[PDB]
Tab-separated table of C-alpha atoms and ligand atoms in Angstrom:
chain	number	residue	atom	x	y	z
H	1	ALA	CA	35.055	7.805	23.180
H	2	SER	CA	32.785	8.568	26.747
H	3	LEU	CA	29.209	6.765	27.538
H	4	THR	CA	28.334	10.831	27.246
H	5	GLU	CA	29.320	10.441	22.370
H	6	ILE	CA	27.735	6.499	23.071
H	7	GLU	CA	24.873	7.237	24.173
H	8	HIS	CA	24.792	10.321	21.795
H	9	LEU	CA	25.253	8.036	19.209
H	10	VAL	CA	22.296	5.726	20.478
H	11	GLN	CA	19.696	8.461	20.754
H	12	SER	CA	21.654	9.796	17.125
H	13	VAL	CA	20.482	5.961	15.752
H	14	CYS	CA	17.007	5.925	16.730
H	15	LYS	CA	16.589	9.401	15.414
H	16	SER	CA	17.332	8.136	12.205
H	17	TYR	CA	15.947	5.211	13.117
H	18	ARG	CA	12.520	7.638	14.092
H	19	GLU	CA	12.107	9.446	10.588
H	20	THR	CA	13.103	6.249	7.953
H	21	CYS	CA	11.082	4.038	10.029
H	22	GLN	CA	8.214	4.265	7.021
H	23	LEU	CA	4.950	3.092	8.876
H	24	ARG	CA	4.396	3.903	12.719
H	25	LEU	CA	3.684	0.994	14.806
H	26	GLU	CA	0.938	3.024	16.559
H	27	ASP	CA	-0.301	2.394	13.535
H	28	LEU	CA	0.497	-0.630	12.179
H	29	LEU	CA	-0.736	-2.089	16.703
H	30	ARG	CA	-4.098	-0.628	15.672
H	31	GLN	CA	-4.528	-2.096	13.132
H	32	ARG	CA	-4.171	-5.546	13.988
H	33	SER	CA	-7.648	-6.500	14.480
H	34	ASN	CA	-8.147	-5.022	10.824
H	35	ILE	CA	-7.967	-8.910	9.018
H	36	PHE	CA	-8.584	-9.752	5.877
H	37	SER	CA	-11.859	-11.628	4.611
H	38	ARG	CA	-11.420	-15.336	3.222
H	39	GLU	CA	-13.576	-13.467	0.337
H	40	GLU	CA	-10.806	-11.360	0.335
H	41	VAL	CA	-7.474	-13.823	0.820
H	42	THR	CA	-9.146	-15.635	-2.258
H	43	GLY	CA	-9.086	-13.069	-3.854
H	44	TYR	CA	-5.455	-12.585	-3.424
H	45	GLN	CA	-5.406	-16.488	-4.336
H	46	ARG	CA	-6.598	-15.987	-7.184
H	47	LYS	CA	-4.605	-13.667	-8.870
H	48	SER	CA	-1.083	-14.751	-11.182
H	49	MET	CA	1.751	-14.772	-9.695
H	50	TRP	CA	2.455	-12.236	-11.765
H	51	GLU	CA	0.546	-10.245	-10.480
H	52	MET	CA	1.621	-10.207	-6.959
H	53	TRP	CA	4.981	-10.558	-7.945
H	54	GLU	CA	4.394	-7.166	-9.287
H	55	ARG	CA	3.133	-6.315	-5.694
H	56	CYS	CA	5.208	-7.338	-3.117
H	57	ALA	CA	8.568	-5.920	-6.103
H	58	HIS	CA	6.667	-2.724	-5.353
H	59	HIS	CA	6.795	-3.017	-1.479
H	60	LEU	CA	10.136	-4.564	-1.399
H	61	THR	CA	11.274	-1.631	-3.370
H	62	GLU	CA	9.478	0.519	-1.596
H	63	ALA	CA	10.724	-0.688	0.916
H	64	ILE	CA	14.515	-0.384	0.664
H	65	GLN	CA	13.924	2.827	-0.113
H	66	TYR	CA	13.559	3.810	3.484
H	67	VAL	CA	16.773	1.332	4.485
H	68	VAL	CA	18.783	3.459	2.277
H	69	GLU	CA	17.522	6.910	3.816
H	70	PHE	CA	18.109	5.684	6.973
H	71	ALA	CA	21.486	4.488	5.962
H	72	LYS	CA	22.197	7.728	4.663
H	73	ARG	CA	21.257	8.959	8.535
H	74	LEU	CA	23.761	7.075	9.972
H	75	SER	CA	26.767	9.469	10.728
H	76	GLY	CA	29.816	8.695	9.040
H	77	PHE	CA	28.072	7.276	6.505
H	78	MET	CA	28.015	9.359	3.862
H	79	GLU	CA	31.845	9.938	4.888
H	80	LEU	CA	32.171	6.594	2.569
H	81	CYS	CA	33.779	6.171	-0.533
H	82	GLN	CA	30.973	5.776	-2.592
H	83	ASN	CA	32.170	2.418	-3.765
H	84	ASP	CA	31.951	1.647	0.283
H	85	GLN	CA	28.198	3.074	0.368
H	86	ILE	CA	26.753	0.741	-2.609
H	87	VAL	CA	28.557	-2.299	-1.300
H	88	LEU	CA	26.954	-2.124	1.955
H	89	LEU	CA	23.435	-1.053	1.000
H	90	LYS	CA	23.981	-3.885	-1.629
H	91	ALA	CA	24.946	-6.510	0.838
H	92	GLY	CA	22.986	-5.190	3.829
H	93	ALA	CA	19.786	-3.326	2.447
H	94	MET	CA	17.545	-6.845	2.259
H	95	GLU	CA	18.392	-8.159	5.402
H	96	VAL	CA	16.991	-4.603	7.391
H	97	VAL	CA	14.222	-5.162	5.649
H	98	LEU	CA	13.541	-9.061	6.843
H	99	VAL	CA	14.619	-7.468	10.503
H	100	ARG	CA	11.690	-4.303	10.285
H	101	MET	CA	9.400	-6.912	8.412
H	102	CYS	CA	8.766	-8.095	12.079
H	103	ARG	CA	6.750	-4.516	13.168
H	104	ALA	CA	4.463	-5.801	10.939
H	105	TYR	CA	3.646	-9.616	11.747
H	106	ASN	CA	0.913	-10.149	14.060
H	107	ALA	CA	3.082	-13.691	16.129
H	108	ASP	CA	-0.621	-13.919	17.888
H	109	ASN	CA	-2.590	-15.441	14.701
H	110	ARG	CA	1.256	-15.740	12.899
H	111	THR	CA	-0.437	-12.703	10.427
H	112	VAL	CA	0.975	-9.964	8.919
H	113	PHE	CA	1.003	-5.932	7.531
H	114	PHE	CA	0.458	-5.969	3.581
H	115	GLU	CA	-1.101	-3.968	1.426
H	116	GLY	CA	-3.648	-2.477	3.939
H	117	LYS	CA	-4.617	-4.958	6.556
H	118	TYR	CA	-3.396	-8.961	7.550
H	119	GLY	CA	-3.285	-11.741	5.700
H	120	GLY	CA	-1.806	-15.676	6.477
H	121	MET	CA	0.940	-16.298	4.320
H	122	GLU	CA	-2.003	-18.010	2.308
H	123	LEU	CA	-2.772	-15.083	1.211
H	124	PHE	CA	0.415	-15.450	-0.762
H	125	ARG	CA	-0.090	-19.086	-2.220
H	126	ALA	CA	-0.486	-17.848	-6.537
H	127	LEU	CA	4.069	-17.023	-5.986
H	128	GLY	CA	4.532	-20.919	-5.416
H	129	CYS	CA	6.946	-20.522	-2.667
H	130	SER	CA	5.287	-21.239	0.613
H	131	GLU	CA	9.360	-22.389	1.643
H	132	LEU	CA	10.579	-19.410	1.308
H	133	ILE	CA	7.263	-17.268	2.604
H	134	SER	CA	7.547	-19.512	5.688
H	135	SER	CA	10.691	-19.301	6.661
H	136	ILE	CA	10.208	-15.462	6.225
H	137	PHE	CA	7.720	-15.784	8.527
H	138	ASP	CA	9.132	-18.093	11.498
H	139	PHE	CA	11.652	-15.462	11.171
H	140	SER	CA	9.683	-12.626	11.819
H	141	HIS	CA	8.074	-14.821	14.379
H	142	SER	CA	11.796	-15.101	16.469
H	143	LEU	CA	11.984	-11.590	16.889
H	144	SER	CA	8.308	-11.055	17.387
H	145	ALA	CA	8.198	-13.263	20.623
H	146	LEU	CA	11.555	-11.382	21.803
H	147	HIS	CA	9.171	-8.084	21.779
H	148	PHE	CA	12.109	-6.107	19.804
H	149	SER	CA	11.760	-2.493	20.338
H	150	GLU	CA	12.525	0.147	17.666
H	151	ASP	CA	15.057	0.852	19.400
H	152	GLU	CA	16.814	-2.161	19.609
H	153	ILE	CA	15.608	-2.883	15.786
H	154	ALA	CA	17.313	-0.019	15.170
H	155	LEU	CA	20.312	-0.129	16.553
H	156	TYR	CA	20.717	-3.809	15.690
H	157	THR	CA	19.511	-2.847	12.090
H	158	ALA	CA	23.012	-0.293	11.973
H	159	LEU	CA	25.180	-3.284	12.939
H	160	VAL	CA	23.512	-5.417	9.909
H	161	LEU	CA	24.349	-2.517	7.471
H	162	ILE	CA	27.377	-1.505	9.105
H	163	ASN	CA	29.793	-4.159	8.846
H	164	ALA	CA	33.295	-4.281	8.439
H	165	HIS	CA	33.168	-7.549	6.214
H	166	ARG	CA	31.755	-7.441	3.253
H	167	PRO	CA	33.834	-8.457	0.513
H	168	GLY	CA	34.109	-5.396	-1.842
H	169	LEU	CA	35.144	-2.538	0.625
H	170	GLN	CA	38.392	-0.458	-0.049
H	171	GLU	CA	38.469	1.459	3.048
H	172	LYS	CA	37.448	-1.557	4.685
H	173	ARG	CA	39.162	0.219	8.122
H	174	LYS	CA	36.558	3.249	8.143
H	175	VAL	CA	33.324	1.104	8.555
H	176	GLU	CA	34.950	-1.303	11.688
H	177	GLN	CA	35.822	1.961	12.772
H	178	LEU	CA	31.467	3.142	12.285
H	179	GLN	CA	30.356	-0.802	13.505
H	180	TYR	CA	32.788	-0.503	16.432
H	181	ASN	CA	31.084	2.454	17.439
H	182	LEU	CA	27.521	1.192	17.109
H	183	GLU	CA	28.589	-2.379	19.312
H	184	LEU	CA	29.530	0.063	21.735
H	185	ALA	CA	25.615	1.668	21.341
H	186	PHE	CA	24.226	-0.866	21.641
H	187	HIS	CA	25.920	-3.457	23.973
H	188	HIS	CA	25.408	0.152	26.369
H	189	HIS	CA	22.191	0.605	25.595
H	190	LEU	CA	21.187	-2.941	26.485
H	191	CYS	CA	22.314	-1.984	29.964
H	192	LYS	CA	20.634	0.597	29.787
H	193	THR	CA	17.323	-0.868	29.372
H	194	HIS	CA	18.236	-3.785	31.218
H	195	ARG	CA	17.987	-6.265	28.164
H	196	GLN	CA	21.076	-7.846	28.370
H	197	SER	CA	18.903	-10.887	28.328
H	198	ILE	CA	18.096	-11.132	24.374
H	199	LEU	CA	21.381	-11.364	23.006
H	200	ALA	CA	21.854	-14.875	23.384
H	201	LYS	CA	18.325	-14.982	21.619
H	202	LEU	CA	19.021	-13.077	18.699
H	203	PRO	CA	19.122	-15.317	15.156
H	204	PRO	CA	22.488	-16.268	14.022
H	205	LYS	CA	24.101	-13.348	11.639
H	206	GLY	CA	23.550	-16.577	9.234
H	207	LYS	CA	20.014	-17.526	9.581
H	208	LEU	CA	19.874	-13.533	8.118
H	209	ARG	CA	22.263	-14.357	5.714
H	210	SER	CA	20.891	-17.631	4.504
H	211	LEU	CA	17.485	-16.382	4.322
H	212	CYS	CA	18.300	-12.987	2.653
H	213	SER	CA	20.367	-15.288	-1.127
H	214	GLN	CA	17.573	-17.373	-0.245
H	215	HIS	CA	15.186	-14.856	-0.695
H	216	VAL	CA	16.972	-12.270	-3.151
H	217	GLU	CA	17.452	-15.473	-5.777
H	218	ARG	CA	13.721	-15.600	-5.895
H	219	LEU	CA	13.437	-12.723	-6.359
H	220	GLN	CA	15.974	-12.763	-8.971
H	221	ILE	CA	14.014	-15.076	-11.471
H	222	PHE	CA	11.062	-13.460	-11.100
H	223	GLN	CA	12.735	-10.239	-12.523
H	224	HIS	CA	14.449	-12.327	-15.626
H	225	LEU	CA	11.115	-12.360	-17.067
H	226	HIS	CA	9.237	-9.010	-16.191
H	227	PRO	CA	11.245	-5.988	-14.804
C	1	6QW	C1	7.883	-5.761	3.109
C	1	6QW	C2	6.990	-6.018	3.097
C	1	6QW	C3	7.179	-7.085	2.327
C	1	6QW	C4	6.145	-7.764	2.286
C	1	6QW	C5	6.132	-9.231	0.946
C	1	6QW	N1	6.691	-9.967	1.376
C	1	6QW	C6	6.554	-10.775	2.884
C	1	6QW	C7	5.437	-11.109	3.047
C	1	6QW	C8	5.547	-12.211	2.251
C	1	6QW	C9	5.653	-11.615	4.473
C	1	6QW	S1	7.691	-10.577	0.192
C	1	6QW	O1	8.070	-8.885	-1.053
C	1	6QW	O2	9.100	-9.990	1.005
C	1	6QW	C10	7.779	-12.121	-0.393
C	1	6QW	C11	8.010	-12.630	-1.958
C	1	6QW	C12	8.087	-11.425	-2.962
C	1	6QW	C13	9.285	-11.609	-3.796
C	1	6QW	C14	9.509	-12.676	-4.292
C	1	6QW	C15	9.953	-13.474	-3.114
C	1	6QW	C16	9.027	-13.308	-1.658
C	1	6QW	C17	4.698	-7.633	3.339
C	1	6QW	C18	4.871	-6.113	3.934
C	1	6QW	C19	5.728	-5.873	4.056
C	1	6QW	C20	6.547	-5.298	4.753
C	1	6QW	C21	6.438	-3.567	4.438
C	1	6QW	C22	6.998	-2.297	5.422
C	1	6QW	C23	6.751	-2.218	6.342
C	1	6QW	S2	7.518	-1.458	8.090
C	1	6QW	C24	9.421	-0.546	7.480
C	1	6QW	O3	7.183	-1.748	8.929
C	1	6QW	O4	7.244	-0.227	7.628
C	1	6QW	C25	7.670	-3.785	7.015
C	1	6QW	C26	6.881	-4.818	6.336
């Protein structure tokens, strides 16, 4: 590996993301002034927890589809044995989604883009899990504060997935290979864009994990009931 090949990896990771980022940043931003009227909010609040579950599950299913496509477009990823490909996605896809989420988050009025407009967290009242919902908003707020760029997301979420410490891995060292190269790519690019400052300011890989497991387990009470 040289700097030229690292930069190729960077450029590549950033192009897989672009091809799989699901929603254009520019559409997201242009629509920040498109906010739910309190009438429309009230409409969401009257819905049963189940209707809301149906919608959220669909949006999360759709989101995860894109994360998978992203990972497939990661060099090295497909070369992995298929057991490991599962292991990584099963452990990492949700975390990546929670990270991608901040693109759709407006920190200036603490709202999120949901089904065509921006709404605050009271939109989700019917689900009856506001500690989970607020913690997600806080997590997205933290990242929006860093002004986390598209390429930073690309490189950062790649490392979320490509983690050789996931229990279950058969050919661990191949993952370390990809992991190590992605860390180099990520760190290098920070220098090139003068964003060294954010590493210290990122939420701990613990924080992402305890959010996602807390998240997945309220998902799993919802899908007990109600496939
Ligand atoms: C994935 C998603 C979800 C939501 C709905 N939920 C989050 C809000 C409550 C913030 S939930 O489903 O996760 C909550 C929930 C559901 C069930 C049980 C417990 C908890 C709203 C916007 C998105 C979204 C879609 C696309 C992008 S992208 C890549 O930029 O294009 C980013 C974000």
